Every structure is written in structure tokens, then in C-alpha cells.
Design a protein around this ligand. Structure first.
Ligand SMILES: N[C@@H](CCC(=O)N[C@@H](CS)C(=O)NCC(=O)O)C(=O)O
Ligand SMILES: N[C@@H](CCC(=O)N[C@@H](CS)C(=O)NCC(=O)O)C(=O)O
Ligand SMILES: c1ccc(-c2ncc(-c3cc[nH]n3)s2)cc1
Ligand SMILES: [Mg+2]
Lengths: 198, 198
């Protein structure tokens, strides 16, 4: 199966798929486009948003739909039907918050105001909810790593760019991040991937 | 299993779960709360949001995570893993859009103005995408009804309250709503359910 992932030159919403490709050792074309080439691609897509994943001539969309598709029947999926539910839920919780950021806002002052509020007022509560939920367990769901741990690590990396002290009071969450960063396939990708802010 | 669904007295984010229960002929307690019973219940929830589903005492959260879990191994989920990806993709596309609405906005003029903006510009764009995606086919994905069709009927029902003429130029999408409403288990539910604006 030939895989071609199209997104911007960013970790962004494509990073979860990139970590999954890496973990399962699947070769794919990591297509990164410049904004100048975006509108011309956007015009041809069923839903006009990226990332998109082409699989054998069939254009998939929605980052998490794609991530879920790639991890189905792999060890990154939950180990029970109920675990796959918790995986899905943690991912959508992380996603709901990340989606609140006005990533495309062109008015810089309005963008900064918004970012600062979400990070200062809302992010600390999400960390508290996740920390309690994790408890003293090794992974967010079950006894082995799932793509929710991957998504936690990814989301938290971006939040830390803007608010570095976010996890000063959550050592257990720092440990989880580090655990994810230590997985050989993930570590390799982290070392070799393009270094972008977002 | 002993299922208990908790949400406000409204269709909202719990309705997709309610359609799934009805369609799969799965018994559950449809527990609805008033504001007054919210602060106590909220305090007991790992993520402080509804809906939640309790399955034999185990608590689940995130509406789409729950819906997907309930459809597991059923034809409603999508027939192949690829179709399941398309089903998931449509669902998030719809949810992404519905999440744009300031449901909680307390300034009535601001709420009206934002709704108008979203219903005037964004909604018709998304409707053109959904319509061409469906084409002259029977259902959104595959050969049979999926919970994406359910979610479409649910999201549009709520949008039609605010912009009744939204689908006036989209007969294929109106036909989809009707095909879904006529499914016997759904027709029954729609008649039995408590009447609420949202
Ligand atoms: N929930 C969607 C969001 C997709 C999305 O809005 N992507 C952005 C980039 S992060 C985009 O397509 N922006 C360009 C545009 O809207 O034209 C997903 O996870 O794929
Ligand atoms: N993406 C989540 C959203 C859950 C959510 O925002 N629930 C709302 C009710 S519609 C809520 O609990 N808001 C009131 C509050 O958080 O106090 C889902 O679909 O379950
Ligand atoms: C989870 C994790 C990361 C993200 C994003 N990061 C940068 C984004 C962006 C910047 C300009 N456009 N889009 S979006 C979203 C959800
Ligand atoms: Mg979502």
C-alpha cells in the first residue's frame, strides 16, 4: 500500500499520523507544502482541509480518523473494547482543547490575547484532569502504550512551546512524555524530523 | 450491560448515542439533569463534561468516543476499516463545525450575530461539500446506513432550527435526513423522545 501524507511543514495535526507510521515501521511520502501552494490543492479536496492521506489512490481526511484507521488491529489500539473507548475519549479531550486555539488568526494582537487566555486560564485545568486520570499508572490507557499517549506527548510539546512552566507541578505527566519520547521508533523520528516551531 | 446515559434535557451531544441505542435495540437509562443537579455530578466526573455513559458502574466520556464504542462490530460502524475511517472522518467534520457555534454565549446580540455569520458563510460551504460527497448515492458511506448518516440528520436538525432554509438548495441532503428519519427504530425514537429546542 502506497502512502502519501500531505500537510503543512509543521508537526501540527499531521504529527500523530507521522508517529504512528514510525512506530509500525511503515514507509510513506511525507509531503509538506508551502502556503503558496495550498489554495490550489484545497480547491480539489472533498473537504478542503489538511492533513489528508492518500492510500492507493483514495484520499482520506481528518487527522484522528486517519490515526484511528492506521492503529486499528495494532498494539497502539486499546487492548479491550472499553480501552479503545478511553483511547478515543482522551484523544478527543486533548483535541477539543487544541482546537480552541485560533491557529489561523491573522490579527496578531487578537491571536496573542486568545492564546494567552487559553494557556493561562484553561490549560492548567486540563493538566490537572489528565494528571488525576493517569494517577500512578504507566500509560494513560491500560498496561501498554496506545496512540493516546502519542497524542498526549504531541499536544503537550506544542503547548510547552508557548508555556514552558505548564508541567512544573505535574512530574507524572513529564514522566509520561519522556516514556513516549524513549520508545525507539519515536525517539528516531524525533531526532530526524524537520525542526519546526509548531 | 446496564447502561446509564447522563446529559441535559436536550438532544445536543447525547442524541447520537440515543439513536445508536434505539437502532441497535439496546436498553439503557436515559437520565437527564437540570442545572441544579449539575455542580454535584460535575465534581464526580474526571473531565467535568457531559454526556457520560456508565456501563456496569464504569464511567465513559466524550460523545463520539461512546457512539463509536457502541457501534463496534455492527454494520452501523462501516463495513470495512476504510469505510470506518470515512465514517469517522464525516463525523469529526460535522462535529468540528458544530463546535464553532457559541452555544454558551450570554450576550444575546453577539450570539445572534455569530450564528448568522456561521449560517451565512460557513454552513453553505460545508453543505456544498457534504452534498457533492454524498452524490446521488443512497448513504454517506458504503451500501448501508452508518452512524455518520445519523450524525448528519442530528446536526442538520439542530442547524435547521436557526436557518430553516439551509437545505432549500440541497434536495439530496434533505432526502438523506428523510431516509434516516424513516428507519423504524429511529422513527419510533424521534416520536418518543422529549421535545426540546436543541
Ligand atoms: N479536525 C481537522 C482539522 C483540519 C484542519 O482545520 N487543518 C488546518 C491546518 S491545521 C487547515 O486545513 N487549514 C487550512 C485551511 O483551512 O484552508 C483534522 O484534525 O484534520
Ligand atoms: N467534545 C465533547 C464535548 C462535551 C461538552 O462540552 N459537554 C458540554 C455540554 S453540551 C458541557 O459539559 N458543558 C458545560 C460545562 O462544561 O460545564 C463531547 O462531545 O462529549
Ligand atoms: C493538536 C496538535 C496540534 C495542533 C496544531 N498545531 C499547529 C496548527 C496550525 C498552525 C497554523 N495552522 N494550523 S494546528 C492541533 C491539534
Ligand atoms: Mg473532535
Amino acid at each position: 500500500p502506497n502512502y502519501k501524507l500531505t500537510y503543512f511543514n509543521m508537526r501540527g495535526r499531521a504529527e500523530i499520523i507521522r508517529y504512528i507510521f514510525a512506530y509500525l515501521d511503515i514507509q510513506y511520502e511525507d509531503h509538506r507544502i508551502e502556503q503558496a501552494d495550498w489554495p490550489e490543492i484545497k480547491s480539489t479536496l472533498p473537504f478542503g482541509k489538511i492533513p489528508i492521506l492518500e492510500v492507493d489512490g483514495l484520499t482520506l481526511h481528518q487527522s484522528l480518523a486517519i490515526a484511528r484507521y492506521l492503529t486499528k488491529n495494532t498494539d497502539l489500539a486499546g487492548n479491550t473494547e472499553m480501552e479503545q473507548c478511553h483511547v478515543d475519549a482522551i484523544v478527543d479531550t486533548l483535541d477539543d482543547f487544541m482546537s480552541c486555539f485560533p491557529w489561523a488568526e491573522k490579527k496578531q494582537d487578537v491571536k496573542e490575547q486568545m492564546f494567552n487566555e487559553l494557556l493561562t486560564y484553561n490549560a492548567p485545568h486540563l493538566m490537572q484532569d489528565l494528571d488525576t486520570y493517569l494517577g500512578g499508572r504507566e500509560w494513560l490507557i491500560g498496561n501498554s502504550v496506545t496512540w493516546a499517549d502519542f497524542y498526549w506527548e504531541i499536544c503537550s510539546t506544542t503547548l510547552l512551546v508557548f508555556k514552558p512552566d505548564l508541567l512544573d507541578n505535574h512530574p507524572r505527566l513529564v514522566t509520561l512524555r519522556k516514556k513516549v519520547q524513549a520508545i525507539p521508533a519515536v525517539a528516531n523520528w524525533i531526532k530526524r524530523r524537520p525542526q519546526t516551531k509548531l
